[PDB]
Ligand binder design. Structure first.
Ligand SMILES: O=P(O)(O)NP(=O)(O)O[C@H]1O[C@H](COP(=O)(O)O)[C@@H](O)[C@H]1O
Ligand SMILES: O=P(O)(O)NP(=O)(O)O[C@H]1O[C@H](COP(=O)(O)O)[C@@H](O)[C@H]1O
Ligand SMILES: [Mg+2]
Ligand SMILES: [Mg+2]
Lengths: 220, 220
């Protein structure tokens, strides 16, 4: 019903740098979507600084307790690094000693995990986006092999869409993960927040097409 | 003859977190070394923040002009990200729009480069360490394939050691790269700086063993 400042600022910048675009788009499904999102267009030092901030404040506000931030290769690698830093920078004394880690796709001269031993540490997984859960599934396999404990996940944008329109539980991608693994899936923003930001920027008519999109596909 | 503050602070932290250790060590060569360095022990949010700062101030002080900061997979990936951010944070208006990029080891569903097109951009390569030049060589191949122009490189620690004791030009690893490619190889610190930091922390005797190490192997 209201957006935190960090969430306004994130959405303002995503639209400005064209990471978030509005129009008529199709997913793999073939499903219509009224926007497109590509976190990769946060691609300058300024925009990465702001992104790091936005993830960090989301994590700080969740009150989740964790020891390590893990990013799945490849796109999670820089995000885990920049967020680990910004948490120490703005989070106070409880985030000074957070570690980061990530996986190589393949070992070498050994190691799949780059970082300190995950054994007995509480892990937050950070990525850009979640759809079928395949990066999450791979991270759990890797982590649980190393005796780490995953306590949560965070993505940039939660689409808050039902994975299937036939499915009568009406579970989104993040919900599905959260149920299977028993952990929170946090996000900087969700579809409801995009909708709220748009109030007073778009026409009555346009407002009614987006607040019907969510009737057909919105989760739970 | 004097250390910048950022260089003192970096060396203080490297010793405190055990990234820099003093004692008797052997390289691959079989060559004795009076220290060991592992940048990977900068592994918490606090320490990564400080590392990012130290690279950024080194880059700002060099006055090198560049458009993109490139990190070779894997260890350069987080360093390029965290440094790109910190440059926007502390560098003022000329570092706001710096981009970062890095390579995948192998393509997929295409792309070796993750980031905006390198064509016609001036690239600074960032890595942890340089020895034989093999990561640098690979980055040049990748970059020049993408029509980018490398303008420089930066590593954490320049060992300032001759690659070979028989070699009568007396070129270090960084010098060798710099000659072959015609670009600066910057570093946060070099061996001479470590020596200077140690003045008044170590005994007269110990000072004389390190200021003889550099007589046998110190470059140029
Ligand atoms: O991170 P990449 O580009 O190396 N690899 P890719 O598998 O394309 O990663 C994307 O898909 C994942 C989401 O997987 P899924 O949730 O769609 O199955 C995220 O990790 C995102 O980076
Ligand atoms: O970065 P990694 O661990 O994926 N791969 P590796 O080839 O071990 O990288 C180290 O060697 C390079 C230095 O290569 P060379 O200068 O010793 O030949 C640096 O990129 C450092 O990260
Ligand atoms: Mg990914
Ligand atoms: Mg490397």
């Amino acid at each position: 019903i209201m957006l935190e400042d960090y969430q306004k600022n994130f959405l303002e910048l995503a639209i400005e740098c064209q990471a978030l675009r509005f129009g008529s788009f199709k997913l793999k499904s073939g499903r219509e979507s009224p926007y497109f999102f590509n976190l990769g267009l946060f691609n300058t030092g300024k925009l990465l600084s702001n992104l790091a901030t936005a993830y960090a404040i989301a994590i700080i506000q969740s009150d989740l307790k964790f020891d390590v931030i893990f990013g799945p290769a490849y796109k999670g690698i820089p995000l885990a690094a920049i967020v680990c830093v910004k948490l120490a920078e703005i989070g106070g004394s409880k985030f000074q000693n957070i570690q980061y880690a990530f996986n190589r796709k393949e070992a070498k001269d050994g190691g799949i995990i780059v970082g300190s031993a995950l054994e007995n540490k509480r892990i937050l997984i950070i990525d850009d986006v979640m759809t079928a859960g395949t990066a999450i599934n791979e991270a759990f396999e890797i982590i649980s092999n190393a005796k780490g404990q995953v306590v949560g996940s965070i993505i940039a944008l939660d689409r808050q869409e039902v994975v299937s329109t036939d499915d009568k539980e009406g579970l989104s991608a993040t919900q599905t993960v959260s149920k299977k693994y028993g952990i929170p899936v946090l996000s900087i923003v969700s579809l409801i927040h995009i909708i709220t930001y748009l109030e007073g920027r778009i026409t009555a008519e346009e407002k009614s097409k987006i607040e019907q999109y969510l009737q057909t596909y919105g989760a739970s």
